[PDB]
Design a protein around this ligand. Structure first.
Ligand SMILES: Cc1ncccc1N[C@@H]1CCC[C@@H]1S(C)(=O)=O
Length: 116
């Protein structure tokens, strides 16, 4: 509270670390469904069903332009990518499996990079 400060983690490396994690996402072989925005004019249903589309290139633009206030907002967007993928795609599909794979890959790097 007022004049009662909680000690807080050093966040000065966060931007560089998130960029590093995102680069590893982008270069993963199963990254292909998520590299660009889904084409809302070519994929029936997508615009109406998925209220907040997100993809790596959009995350990369936001990261590069100071649009994430903190590392949690960055992680919300990354997870949004895989949550959208699960909403729209069957688990037993190439894209669907790609998403499950990429989520697992992200979550480990996230724990390995930040959680002590
Ligand atoms: C992630 C997703 N979910 C539902 C429909 C399509 C997609 N991705 C597409 C599949 C191949 C690449 C395109 S994209 C995103 O490059 O236009």
């Amino acid at each position: 509270s007022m004049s009662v400060k909680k000690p807080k983690r050093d966040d000065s490396k966060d931007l560089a670390l998130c960029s590093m994690i995102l680069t590893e996402m982008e270069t993963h072989e199963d990254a292909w469904p998520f590299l660009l925005p889904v084409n809302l004019k070519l994929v029936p249903g997508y615009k109406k069903v998925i209220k907040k589309p997100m993809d790596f290139s959009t995350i990369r633009e936001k990261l590069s332009s100071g649009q994430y206030p903190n590392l949690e907002t960055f992680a919300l967007d990354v997870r949004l990518v895989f949550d959208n993928c699960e909403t729209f795609n069957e688990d037993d599909s190439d894209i669907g499996r790609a998403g499950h794979n990429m989520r697992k890959y992200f979550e480990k790097k996230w724990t390995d990079t930040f959680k002590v």
